[PDB]
Amino acid sequence: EKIPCSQPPQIEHGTINSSRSSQESYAHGTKLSYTCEGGFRISEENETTCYMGKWSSPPQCEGLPCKSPPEISHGVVAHMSDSYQYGEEVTYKCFEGFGIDGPAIAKCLGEKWSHPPSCI
């Protein structure tokens, strides 16, 4: 007997738009609509569905102008632009006395960025 779901998932930078705060749990075969931060544009029908207590990936919100890359603790992007519009990448450098991980980038997602550099 299908498990109900809990607080719907979050889109990279969004939340559910199903009667704000009414319920905590949802049923199985439950499809709620979605909404993202002020500005963001949502593509591919703003709806999510619930199966066995697990939710499916939300819609895809983005379309928003992002800011320049964020700054970091162990690296620094010197090759950053001024007009970075969502879903774009930058590459920072490392410092001295640090080691390296995987990506020495930061990736924007409509507003801020993702996985900042690999120099820890």
DSSP type of residue 35? E
Cα dihedral across residues 86, 109, 35, 50: positive or negative: positive
Q: By CB neighbour count within 10 A (0-12 exposed, 13-18 middle, 19+ buried), where does 1 fall?
A: exposed
Tell me if 12 sits within 8 A of 40, measured CB to CB: no
Return the CATH fold of 65-120.
Complement Module; domain 1 (2.10.70)
Exp. method? NMR
DSSP state of 57: P
Beta strands (DSSP E) in the chain are 14-16, 30-36, 41-43, 47-51, 54-55, 60-62, 76-79, 89-93, 105-107
Tell me if domain 1-64 and domain 65-120 are identical in fold: yes
Q: Are 51 and 31 in contact (CB under 8 A)?
A: no
Task: Report the candidate in 35, 39, 91, 36 with the shortest Cα–Cα distance to residue 65.
Answer: 39
Spelled out in words, what is the top-level CATH class assigned to the domain 1-64? mainly beta
Q: Any idea which residue has 């909404």 for tokens? A: 35
The ranges assigned to domains in the chain are 1-64, 65-120
Q: Residue 13 carries which side chain, given as an amino acid letter?
A: H
